[PDB]
Short mmCIF file of C-alpha atoms and ligand atoms in Angstrom, two decimals:
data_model
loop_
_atom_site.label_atom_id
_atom_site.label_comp_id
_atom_site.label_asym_id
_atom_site.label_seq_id
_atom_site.Cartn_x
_atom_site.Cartn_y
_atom_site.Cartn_z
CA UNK A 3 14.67 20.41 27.98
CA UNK A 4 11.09 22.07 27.34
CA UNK A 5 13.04 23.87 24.55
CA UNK A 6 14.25 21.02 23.10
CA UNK A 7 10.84 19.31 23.25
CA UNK A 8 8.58 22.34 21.62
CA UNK A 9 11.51 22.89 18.64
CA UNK A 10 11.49 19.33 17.82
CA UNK A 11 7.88 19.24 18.15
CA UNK A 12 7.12 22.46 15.77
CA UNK A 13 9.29 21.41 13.22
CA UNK A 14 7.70 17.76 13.15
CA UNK A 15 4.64 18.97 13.00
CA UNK A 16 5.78 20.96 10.10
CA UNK A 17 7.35 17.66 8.33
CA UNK A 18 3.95 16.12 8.57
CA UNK A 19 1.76 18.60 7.75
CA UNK A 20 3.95 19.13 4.80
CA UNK A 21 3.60 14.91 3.83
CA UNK A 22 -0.37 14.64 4.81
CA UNK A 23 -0.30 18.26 1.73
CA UNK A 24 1.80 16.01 -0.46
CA UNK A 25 -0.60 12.85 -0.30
CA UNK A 26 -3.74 14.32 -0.18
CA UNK A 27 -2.77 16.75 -3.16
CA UNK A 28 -1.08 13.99 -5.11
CA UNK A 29 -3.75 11.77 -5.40
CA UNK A 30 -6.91 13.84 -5.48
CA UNK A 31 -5.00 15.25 -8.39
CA UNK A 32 -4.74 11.66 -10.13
CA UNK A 33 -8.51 10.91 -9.50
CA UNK A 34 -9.73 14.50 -10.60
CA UNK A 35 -7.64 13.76 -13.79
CA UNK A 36 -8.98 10.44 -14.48
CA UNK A 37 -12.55 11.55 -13.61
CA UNK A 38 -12.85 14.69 -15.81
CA UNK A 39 -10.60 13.21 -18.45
CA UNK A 40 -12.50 10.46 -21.54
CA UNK A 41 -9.22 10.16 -22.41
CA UNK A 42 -7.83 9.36 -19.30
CA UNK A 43 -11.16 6.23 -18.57
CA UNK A 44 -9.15 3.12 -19.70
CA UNK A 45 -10.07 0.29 -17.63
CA UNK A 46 -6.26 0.19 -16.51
CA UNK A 47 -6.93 3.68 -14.98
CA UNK A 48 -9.82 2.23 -13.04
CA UNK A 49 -7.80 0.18 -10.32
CA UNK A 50 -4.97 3.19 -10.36
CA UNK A 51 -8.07 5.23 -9.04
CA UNK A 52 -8.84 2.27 -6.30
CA UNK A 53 -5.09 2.58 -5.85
CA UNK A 54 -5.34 5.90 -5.40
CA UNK A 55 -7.82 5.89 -2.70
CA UNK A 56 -6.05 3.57 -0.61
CA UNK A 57 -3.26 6.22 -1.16
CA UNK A 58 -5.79 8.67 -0.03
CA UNK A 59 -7.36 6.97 3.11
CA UNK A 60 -3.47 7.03 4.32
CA UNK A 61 -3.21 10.74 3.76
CA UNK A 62 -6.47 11.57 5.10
CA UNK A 63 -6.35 8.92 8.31
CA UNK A 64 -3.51 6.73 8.59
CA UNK A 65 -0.37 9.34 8.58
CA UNK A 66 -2.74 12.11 10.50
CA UNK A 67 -3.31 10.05 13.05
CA UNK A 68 0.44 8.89 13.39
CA UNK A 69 1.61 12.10 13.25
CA UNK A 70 -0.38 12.77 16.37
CA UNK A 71 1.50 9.80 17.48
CA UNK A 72 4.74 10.73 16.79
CA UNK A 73 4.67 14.47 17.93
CA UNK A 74 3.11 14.14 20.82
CA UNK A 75 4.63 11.22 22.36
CA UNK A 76 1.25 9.28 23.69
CA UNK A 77 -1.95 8.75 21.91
CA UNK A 78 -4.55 10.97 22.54
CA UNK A 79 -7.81 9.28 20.89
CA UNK A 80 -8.29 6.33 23.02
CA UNK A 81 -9.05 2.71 22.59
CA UNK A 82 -11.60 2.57 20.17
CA UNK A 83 -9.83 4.74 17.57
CA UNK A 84 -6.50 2.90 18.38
CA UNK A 85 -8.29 -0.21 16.89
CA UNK A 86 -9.44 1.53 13.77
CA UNK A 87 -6.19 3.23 12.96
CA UNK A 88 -4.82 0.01 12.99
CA UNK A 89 -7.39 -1.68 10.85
CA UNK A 90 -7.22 1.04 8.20
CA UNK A 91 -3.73 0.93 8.22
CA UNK A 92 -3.23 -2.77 7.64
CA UNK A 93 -6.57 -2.92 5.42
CA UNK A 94 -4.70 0.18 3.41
CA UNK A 95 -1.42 -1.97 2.54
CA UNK A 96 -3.63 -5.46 1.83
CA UNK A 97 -5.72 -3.36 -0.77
CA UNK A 98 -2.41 -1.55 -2.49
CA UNK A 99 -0.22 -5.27 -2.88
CA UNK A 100 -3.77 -6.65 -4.09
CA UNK A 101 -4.80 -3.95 -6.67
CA UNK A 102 -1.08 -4.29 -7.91
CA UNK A 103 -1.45 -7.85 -8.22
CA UNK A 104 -4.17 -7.12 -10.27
CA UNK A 105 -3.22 -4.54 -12.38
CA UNK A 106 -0.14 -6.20 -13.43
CA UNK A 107 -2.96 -9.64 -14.43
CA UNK A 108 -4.87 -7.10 -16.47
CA UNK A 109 -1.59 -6.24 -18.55
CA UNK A 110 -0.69 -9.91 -19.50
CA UNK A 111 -4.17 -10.39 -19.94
CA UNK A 112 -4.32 -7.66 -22.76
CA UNK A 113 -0.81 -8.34 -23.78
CA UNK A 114 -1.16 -12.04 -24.47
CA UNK A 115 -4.89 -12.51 -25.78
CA UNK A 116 -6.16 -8.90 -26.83
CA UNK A 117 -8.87 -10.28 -28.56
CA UNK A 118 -10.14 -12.83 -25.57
CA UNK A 119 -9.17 -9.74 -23.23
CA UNK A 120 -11.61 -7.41 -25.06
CA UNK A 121 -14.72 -9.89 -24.82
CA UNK A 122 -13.73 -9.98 -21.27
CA UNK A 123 -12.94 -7.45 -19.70
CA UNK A 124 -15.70 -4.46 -19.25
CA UNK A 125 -16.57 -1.37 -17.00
CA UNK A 126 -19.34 -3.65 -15.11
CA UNK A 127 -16.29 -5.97 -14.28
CA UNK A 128 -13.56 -4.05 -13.73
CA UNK A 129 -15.88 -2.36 -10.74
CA UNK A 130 -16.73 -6.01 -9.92
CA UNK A 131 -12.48 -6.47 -9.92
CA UNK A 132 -12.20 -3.66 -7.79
CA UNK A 133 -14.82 -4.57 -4.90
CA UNK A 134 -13.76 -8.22 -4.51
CA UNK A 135 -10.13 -6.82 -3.64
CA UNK A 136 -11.52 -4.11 -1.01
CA UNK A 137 -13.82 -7.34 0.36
CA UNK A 138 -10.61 -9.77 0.39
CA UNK A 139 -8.80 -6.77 1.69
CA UNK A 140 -11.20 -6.02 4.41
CA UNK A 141 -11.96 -9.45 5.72
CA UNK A 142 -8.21 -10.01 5.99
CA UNK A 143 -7.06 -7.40 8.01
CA UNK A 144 -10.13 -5.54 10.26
CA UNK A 145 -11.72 -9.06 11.48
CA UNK A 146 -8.37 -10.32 13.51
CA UNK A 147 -7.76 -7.02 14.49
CA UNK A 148 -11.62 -6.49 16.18
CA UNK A 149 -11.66 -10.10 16.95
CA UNK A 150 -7.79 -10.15 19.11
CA UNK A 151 -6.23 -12.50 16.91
CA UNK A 152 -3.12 -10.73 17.19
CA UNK A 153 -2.61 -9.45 21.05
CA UNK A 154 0.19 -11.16 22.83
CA UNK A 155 0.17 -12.59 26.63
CA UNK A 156 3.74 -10.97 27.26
CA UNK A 157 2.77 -8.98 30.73
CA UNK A 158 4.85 -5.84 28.93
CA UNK A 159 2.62 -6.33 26.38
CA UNK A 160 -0.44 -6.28 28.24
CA UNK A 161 0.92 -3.07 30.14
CA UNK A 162 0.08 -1.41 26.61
CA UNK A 163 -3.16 -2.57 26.02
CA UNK A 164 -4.04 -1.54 29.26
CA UNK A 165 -2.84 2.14 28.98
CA UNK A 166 -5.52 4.67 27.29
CA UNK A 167 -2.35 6.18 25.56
CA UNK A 168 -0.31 3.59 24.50
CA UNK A 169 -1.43 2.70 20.70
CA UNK A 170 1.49 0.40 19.94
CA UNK A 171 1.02 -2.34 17.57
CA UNK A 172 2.66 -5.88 19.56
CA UNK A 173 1.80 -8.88 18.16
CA UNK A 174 2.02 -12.72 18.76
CA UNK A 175 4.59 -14.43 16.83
CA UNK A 176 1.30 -16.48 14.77
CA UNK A 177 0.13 -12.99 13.53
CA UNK A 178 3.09 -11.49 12.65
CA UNK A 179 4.19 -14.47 10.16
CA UNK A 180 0.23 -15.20 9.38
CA UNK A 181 -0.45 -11.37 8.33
CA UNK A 182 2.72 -10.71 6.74
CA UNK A 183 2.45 -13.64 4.49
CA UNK A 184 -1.15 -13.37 4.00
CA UNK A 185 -1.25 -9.43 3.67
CA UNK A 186 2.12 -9.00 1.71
CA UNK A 187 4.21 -11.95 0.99
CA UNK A 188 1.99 -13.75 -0.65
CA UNK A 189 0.19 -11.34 -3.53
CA UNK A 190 4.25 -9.76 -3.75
CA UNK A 191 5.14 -13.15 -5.26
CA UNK A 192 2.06 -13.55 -7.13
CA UNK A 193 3.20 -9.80 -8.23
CA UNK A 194 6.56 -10.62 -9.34
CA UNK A 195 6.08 -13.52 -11.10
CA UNK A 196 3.45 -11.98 -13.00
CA UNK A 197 5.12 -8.85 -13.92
CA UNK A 198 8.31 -11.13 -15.12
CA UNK A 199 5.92 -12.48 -17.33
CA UNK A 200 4.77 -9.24 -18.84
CA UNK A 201 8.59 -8.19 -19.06
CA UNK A 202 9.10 -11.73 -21.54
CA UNK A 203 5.92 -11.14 -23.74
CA UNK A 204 7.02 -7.26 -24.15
CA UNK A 205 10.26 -8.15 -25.31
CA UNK A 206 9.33 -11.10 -27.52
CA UNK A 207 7.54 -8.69 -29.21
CA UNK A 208 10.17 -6.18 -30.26
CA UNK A 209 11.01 -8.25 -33.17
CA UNK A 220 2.74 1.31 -35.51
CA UNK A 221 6.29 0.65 -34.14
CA UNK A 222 5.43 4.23 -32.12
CA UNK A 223 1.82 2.92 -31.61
CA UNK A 224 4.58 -0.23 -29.36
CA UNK A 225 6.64 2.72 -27.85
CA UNK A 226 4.36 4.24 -26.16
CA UNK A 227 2.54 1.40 -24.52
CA UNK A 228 6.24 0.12 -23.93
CA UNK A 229 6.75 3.49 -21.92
CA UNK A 230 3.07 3.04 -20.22
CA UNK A 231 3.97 -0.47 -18.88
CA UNK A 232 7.61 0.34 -17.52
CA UNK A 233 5.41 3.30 -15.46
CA UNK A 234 3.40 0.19 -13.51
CA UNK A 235 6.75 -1.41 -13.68
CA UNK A 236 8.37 1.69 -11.61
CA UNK A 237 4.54 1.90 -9.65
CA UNK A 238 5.12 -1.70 -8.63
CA UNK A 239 9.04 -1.67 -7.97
CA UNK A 240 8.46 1.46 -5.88
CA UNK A 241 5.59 -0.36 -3.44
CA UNK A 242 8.28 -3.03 -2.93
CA UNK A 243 11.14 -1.08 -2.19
CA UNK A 244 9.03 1.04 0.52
CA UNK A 245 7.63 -2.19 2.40
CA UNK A 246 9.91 -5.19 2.14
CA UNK A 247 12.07 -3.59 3.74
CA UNK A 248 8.90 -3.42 6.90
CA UNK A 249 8.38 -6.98 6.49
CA UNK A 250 11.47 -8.72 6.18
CA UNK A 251 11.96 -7.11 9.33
CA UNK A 252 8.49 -8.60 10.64
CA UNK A 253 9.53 -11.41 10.68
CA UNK A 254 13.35 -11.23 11.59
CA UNK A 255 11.96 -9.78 14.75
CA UNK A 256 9.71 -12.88 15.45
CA UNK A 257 13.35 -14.86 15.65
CA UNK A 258 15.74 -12.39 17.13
CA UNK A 259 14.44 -9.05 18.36
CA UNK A 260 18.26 -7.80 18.77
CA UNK A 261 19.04 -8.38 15.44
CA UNK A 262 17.71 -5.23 14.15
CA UNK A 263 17.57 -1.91 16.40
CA UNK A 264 14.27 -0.40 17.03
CA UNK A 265 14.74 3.03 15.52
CA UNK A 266 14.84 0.89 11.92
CA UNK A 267 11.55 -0.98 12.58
CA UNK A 268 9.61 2.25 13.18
CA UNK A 269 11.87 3.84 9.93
CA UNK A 270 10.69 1.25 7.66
CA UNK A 271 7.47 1.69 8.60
CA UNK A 272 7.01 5.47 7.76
CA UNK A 273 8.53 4.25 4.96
CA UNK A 274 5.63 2.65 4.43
CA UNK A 275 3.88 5.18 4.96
CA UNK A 276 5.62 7.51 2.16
CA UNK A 277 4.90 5.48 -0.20
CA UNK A 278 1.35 7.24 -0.84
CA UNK A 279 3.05 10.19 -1.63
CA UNK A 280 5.11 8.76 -4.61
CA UNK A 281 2.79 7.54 -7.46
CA UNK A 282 1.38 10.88 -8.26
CA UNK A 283 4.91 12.19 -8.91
CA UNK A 284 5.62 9.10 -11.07
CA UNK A 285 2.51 9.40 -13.14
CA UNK A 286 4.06 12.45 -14.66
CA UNK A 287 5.97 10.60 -16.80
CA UNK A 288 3.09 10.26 -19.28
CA UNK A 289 2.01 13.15 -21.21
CA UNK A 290 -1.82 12.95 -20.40
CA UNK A 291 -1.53 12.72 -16.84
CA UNK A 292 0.97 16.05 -17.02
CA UNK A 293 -1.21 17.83 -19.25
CA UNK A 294 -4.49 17.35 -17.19
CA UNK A 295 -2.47 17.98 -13.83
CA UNK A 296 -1.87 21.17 -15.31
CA UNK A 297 -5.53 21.22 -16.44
CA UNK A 298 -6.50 21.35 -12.90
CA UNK A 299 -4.14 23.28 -10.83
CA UNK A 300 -5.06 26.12 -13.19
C1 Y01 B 1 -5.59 -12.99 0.86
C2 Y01 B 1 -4.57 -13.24 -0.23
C3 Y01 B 1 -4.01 -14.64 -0.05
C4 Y01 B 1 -5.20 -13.07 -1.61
C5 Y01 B 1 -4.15 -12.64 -2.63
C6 Y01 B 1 -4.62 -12.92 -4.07
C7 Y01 B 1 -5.06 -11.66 -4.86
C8 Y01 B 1 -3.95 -10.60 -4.93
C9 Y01 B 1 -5.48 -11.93 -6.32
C10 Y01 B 1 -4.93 -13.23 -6.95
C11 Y01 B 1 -5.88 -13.42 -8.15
C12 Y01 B 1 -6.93 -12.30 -8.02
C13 Y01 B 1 -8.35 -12.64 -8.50
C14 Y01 B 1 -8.39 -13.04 -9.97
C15 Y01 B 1 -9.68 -12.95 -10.51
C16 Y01 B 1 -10.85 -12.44 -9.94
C17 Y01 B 1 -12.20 -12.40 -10.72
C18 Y01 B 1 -12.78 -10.96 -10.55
O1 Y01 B 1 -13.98 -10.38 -11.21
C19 Y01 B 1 -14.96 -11.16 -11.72
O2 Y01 B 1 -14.92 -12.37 -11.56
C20 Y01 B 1 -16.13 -10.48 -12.45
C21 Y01 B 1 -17.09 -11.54 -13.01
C22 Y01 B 1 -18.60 -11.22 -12.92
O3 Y01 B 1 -19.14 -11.16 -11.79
O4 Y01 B 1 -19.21 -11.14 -14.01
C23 Y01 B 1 -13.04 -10.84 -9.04
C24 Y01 B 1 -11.69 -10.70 -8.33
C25 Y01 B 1 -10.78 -11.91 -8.51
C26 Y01 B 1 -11.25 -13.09 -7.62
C27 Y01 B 1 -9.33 -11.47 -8.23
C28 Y01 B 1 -9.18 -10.82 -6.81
C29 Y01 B 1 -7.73 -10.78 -6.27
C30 Y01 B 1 -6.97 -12.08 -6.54
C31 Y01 B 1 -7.56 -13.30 -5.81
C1 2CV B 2 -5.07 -12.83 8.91
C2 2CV B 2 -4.45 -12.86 10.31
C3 2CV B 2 -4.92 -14.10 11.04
C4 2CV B 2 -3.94 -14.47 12.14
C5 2CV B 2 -4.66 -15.36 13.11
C6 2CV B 2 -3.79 -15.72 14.28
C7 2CV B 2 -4.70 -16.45 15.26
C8 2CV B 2 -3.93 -17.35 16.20
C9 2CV B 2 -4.15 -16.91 17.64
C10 2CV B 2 -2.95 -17.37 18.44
O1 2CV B 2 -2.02 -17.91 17.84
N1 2CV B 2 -2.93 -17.13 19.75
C11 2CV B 2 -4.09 -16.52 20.44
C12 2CV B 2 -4.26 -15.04 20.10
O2 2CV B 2 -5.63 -14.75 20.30
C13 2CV B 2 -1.77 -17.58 20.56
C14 2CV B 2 -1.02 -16.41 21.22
O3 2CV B 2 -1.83 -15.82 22.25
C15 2CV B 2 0.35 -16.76 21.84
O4 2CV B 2 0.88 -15.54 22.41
C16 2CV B 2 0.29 -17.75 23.02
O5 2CV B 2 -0.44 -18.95 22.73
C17 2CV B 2 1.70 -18.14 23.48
O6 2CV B 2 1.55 -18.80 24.74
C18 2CV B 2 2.44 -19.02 22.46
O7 2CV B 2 3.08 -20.16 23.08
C1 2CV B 3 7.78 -22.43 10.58
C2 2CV B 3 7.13 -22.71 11.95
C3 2CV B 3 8.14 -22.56 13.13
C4 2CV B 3 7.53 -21.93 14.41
C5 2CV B 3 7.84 -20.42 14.50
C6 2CV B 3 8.30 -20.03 15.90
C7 2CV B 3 9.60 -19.23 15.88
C8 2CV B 3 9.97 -18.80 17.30
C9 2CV B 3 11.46 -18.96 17.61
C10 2CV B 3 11.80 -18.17 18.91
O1 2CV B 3 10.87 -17.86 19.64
N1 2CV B 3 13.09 -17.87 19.20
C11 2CV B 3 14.22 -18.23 18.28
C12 2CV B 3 15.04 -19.45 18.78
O2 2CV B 3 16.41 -19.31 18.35
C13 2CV B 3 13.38 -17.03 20.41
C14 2CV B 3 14.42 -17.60 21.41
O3 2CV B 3 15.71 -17.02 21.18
C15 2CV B 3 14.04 -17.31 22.87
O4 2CV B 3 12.61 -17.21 23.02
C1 5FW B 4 2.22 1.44 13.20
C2 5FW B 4 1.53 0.11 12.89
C3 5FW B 4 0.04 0.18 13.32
N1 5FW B 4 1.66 -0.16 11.44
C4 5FW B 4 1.24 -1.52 11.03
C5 5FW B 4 1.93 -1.90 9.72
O1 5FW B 4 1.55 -0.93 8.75
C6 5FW B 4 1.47 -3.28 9.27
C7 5FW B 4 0.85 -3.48 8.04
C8 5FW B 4 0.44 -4.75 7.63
C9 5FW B 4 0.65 -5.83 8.48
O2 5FW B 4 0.26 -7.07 8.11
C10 5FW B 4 1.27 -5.62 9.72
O3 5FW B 4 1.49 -6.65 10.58
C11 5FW B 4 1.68 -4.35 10.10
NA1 NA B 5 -3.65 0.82 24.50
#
């Protein structure tokens, strides 16, 4: 029994350690590149560094602290802390969704008025872009958290908010709908129909034709970027709110799955930037 415990905790540790590597070294890699690299400064590449860093606050904080978590069976950091892993973890998803959201305006911006779009957009606003969304992001997800919106009067429930090492996340039914559709659903539809929109003007323009290839191959990249970031949370969310309605419906074990999930999503956009040249030939740049 004690055997059991210190092999599966060793190798989970090991697991983790090995995901918090592939994060953190992913995406310092991507905002290296775009730092040291002119070529690298488009505007575009300006909110995949804020993306990046919300990758990286995950890597750095969010998975660390989980990974505590789920090793060692209770959390160790107290009450305070509990509250802030939870805020940076919701604020870290709200900020991704948005930034997407964004990104994918920018491209039908500069895909259907590149003239308008250049007299538009600059350096001084893209920052400007880029702040609004951590604000938005910020307001939306660390004030109801600090301010109790979402604890629940359930005496179970209150059992865990009691404990020093319980750092479970239950929720009244009003904040589970409210911040799923406010934190995901909602900029995921604004998302989609936006990037079906870039998808149409892309195509009905088809019919120099390598100068269209390659910015053809750069927006099917944020295509896979954005498909990716849906594929790892839906699946979280639907769930959300499934268990608002039915909590037998789906077993437990898939909730907290779906989450890490989640999670692992950080660790996936530096391995798809490498299907552009640059990015490959400044990771190799760096790494030495
Ligand atoms: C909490 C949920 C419901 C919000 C989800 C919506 C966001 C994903 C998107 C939708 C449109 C985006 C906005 C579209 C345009 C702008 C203008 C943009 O930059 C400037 O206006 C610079 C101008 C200057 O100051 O000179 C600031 C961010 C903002 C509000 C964007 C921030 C994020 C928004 C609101
Ligand atoms: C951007 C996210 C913002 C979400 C804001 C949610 C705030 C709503 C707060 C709320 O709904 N409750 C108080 C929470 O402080 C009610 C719950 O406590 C509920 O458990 C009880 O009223 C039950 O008795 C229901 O019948
Ligand atoms: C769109 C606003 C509709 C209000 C949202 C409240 C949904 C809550 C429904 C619910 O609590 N149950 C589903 C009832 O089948 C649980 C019951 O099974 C027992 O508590
Ligand atoms: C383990 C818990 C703290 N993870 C929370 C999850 O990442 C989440 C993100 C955004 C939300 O709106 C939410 O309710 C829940
Ligand atoms: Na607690």
């Amino acid at each position: 029994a004690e055997l059991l415990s210190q092999q599966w905790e060793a190798g989970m540790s090991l697991l983790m350690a090995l995901v918090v590597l592939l994060i953190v070294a992913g995406n310092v890699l991507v905002i290296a590149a775009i730092g040291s690299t002119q070529r690298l400064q488009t505007l575009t590449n300006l909110f995949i560094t804020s993306l990046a860093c919300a990758d990286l606050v995950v890597g750095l904080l969010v998975v660390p602290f989980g990974a505590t978590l789920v090793v060692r069976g209770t959390w160790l950091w107290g009450s305070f802390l509990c509250e802030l892993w939870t805020s940076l973890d919701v604020l870290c998803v709200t900020a991704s969704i948005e930034t997407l959201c964004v990104i994918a305006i920018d491209r039908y911006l500069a895909i259907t008025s590149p003239f308008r779009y250049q007299s538009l957009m600059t350096r001084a606003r893209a920052k400007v872009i880029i702040c609004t969304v951590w604000a938005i992001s910020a307001l939306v997800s660390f004030l109801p958290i600090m301010m109790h919106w979402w604890r629940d009067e359930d005496p179970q429930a209150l059992k865990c908010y009691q404990d020093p090492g319980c750092c479970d996340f239950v929720t009244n039914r009003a904040y589970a709908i409210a911040s799923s559709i406010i934190s995901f659903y909602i900029p995921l539809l604004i998302m989609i129909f936006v990037a079906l929109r870039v998808y149409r003007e892309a195509k009905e323009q088809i019919r120099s034709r390598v100068m269209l290839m390659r910015e053809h191959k750069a927006l099917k990249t944020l295509g896979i970027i954005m498909g990716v970031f849906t594929l790892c949370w839906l699946p979280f969310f639907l769930v959300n709110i499934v268990n608002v309605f039915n909590r037998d419906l789906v077993p437990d074990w898939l909730f907290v799955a779906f989450n890490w999930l989640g999670y692992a999503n950080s660790a996936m956009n530096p391995i798809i930037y490498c299907r552009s040249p640059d990015f490959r030939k400044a990771f190799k740049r760096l790494l030495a």
